[PDB]
Amino acid sequence: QYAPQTQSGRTSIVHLFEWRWVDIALECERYLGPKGFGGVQVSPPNENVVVTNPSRPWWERYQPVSYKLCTRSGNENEFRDMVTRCNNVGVRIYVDAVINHMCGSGAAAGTGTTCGSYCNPGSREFPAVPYSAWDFNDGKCKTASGGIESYNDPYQVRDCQLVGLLDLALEKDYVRSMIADYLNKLIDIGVAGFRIDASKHMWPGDIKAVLDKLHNLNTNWFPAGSRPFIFQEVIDLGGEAISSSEYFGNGRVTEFKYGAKLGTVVRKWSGEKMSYLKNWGEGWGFMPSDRALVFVDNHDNQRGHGAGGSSILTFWDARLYKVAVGFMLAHPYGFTRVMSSYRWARNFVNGEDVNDWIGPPNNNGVIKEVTINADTTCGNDWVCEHRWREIRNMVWFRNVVDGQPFANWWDNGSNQVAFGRGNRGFIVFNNDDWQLSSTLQTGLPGGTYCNVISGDKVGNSCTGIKVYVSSDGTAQFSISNSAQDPFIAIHAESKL
């Protein structure tokens, strides 16, 4: 639950948020495989309650009604096809596992569900699993409302209903077994691992108890004895009763401090400066690097009200976003996940985006296919940040420099910064309102290197900026504050 089980040399995951399975398969074959991505985090593949008010929001998929692999992303055949095709090109599949709860306790009974299964939330009846009343934590929860009333009480956080969602009795062997059966079906299909949704709301030992029931990964693609990669979603910015460290025994943990703090720095809010990033990582009070799953934004906080607030950088702020993502992908801290989004019509009213609920691009609830434009961008309102040259080349960067130590840090005492990764890569940022022009030790062998942010090494030439590194490892870097991308990155596989 700790080794990502990505194909050798691949060091990142991309969240293909709300993508259809067939589109993911195609993207794996045509793009993610060749471009060195380690894997894809997929939206919950299990059947969820249909929410019609508002019209099919994205968050309906976090309200399960069964474990049938039957969603707006596709059916079981398409999911299997996706996992097979992706694994066959060295791209792993990681499932968003929603296991703390079922749908809303206040939902009506009936077949308004993505596969047409019946459920009766009020009577805790989910016959398609099956679950019944004694499979939920209603008798365990100690609050008057039956919901979570206070985050100061870890018992309430774990045993009560999260925003009215029916809370499963994860202490019970039966529930653990149903969940394990679901996850094991996914593993046998060929899944490499799981994002554990709402981990704060489950006891660490219940999660462990579930993980211990899990099969080894499918030996068609993985070595014998391979354990699923596990990363648990826990939001802990500090100061609450529940700490991230409680979950370190189960696998990696999402480090939400990362994108919040990085966002604050790159936006230059609160007196923050990029030069402060010298001791980025555990030096900022973050969790151990080998416990962290890191990211600039996720599907929640990219909409301006998740963990981090307005400080979070997103595709809407593409230039600074690219700066932050590039820094993260160059820096050794954590295991990196890049977000891939669709654009919705944002509408801020009194600080709230009232369209932050809008689901993926669709015709009458049917999700639109991912179309590829001639310039390699996507149509149909898929943003495809993972296709941006500045981001994909940094994914490759991260693959190239994997294992190399932090080295040759430089800063201007302000917002111009640089560092390398052993002798295999180097990166330079200008976030000041004036020209960057410095001669820096890159740690790299002498030669001419293509800047992979402004361009590419294509055969034996550069399509963008060229950096000449002398034999002593020093090079001149010139970056205007008005540059389209005010940072340059070079590595061993970009040398001419």
Binding site: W58, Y151, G238, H305
Partner: protein
């Protein structure tokens, strides 16, 4: 900026206040409110 905002779960975020409106629900003990309540509505 950062602003006031207290994230609870997918599709549920509140506003940090000392006390919540008649039609709002309260969540105590959230660090980002700094002693305040998180005042939210669920979209269901």
């Amino acid at each position: 900026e950062s602003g006031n905002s207290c994230y609870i779960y997918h599709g549920v975020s509140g506003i940090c206040k000392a006390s919540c409106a008649e039609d709002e629900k309260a969540m105590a003990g959230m660090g980002v409110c700094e002693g305040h309540l998180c005042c939210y509505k669920t979209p269901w």
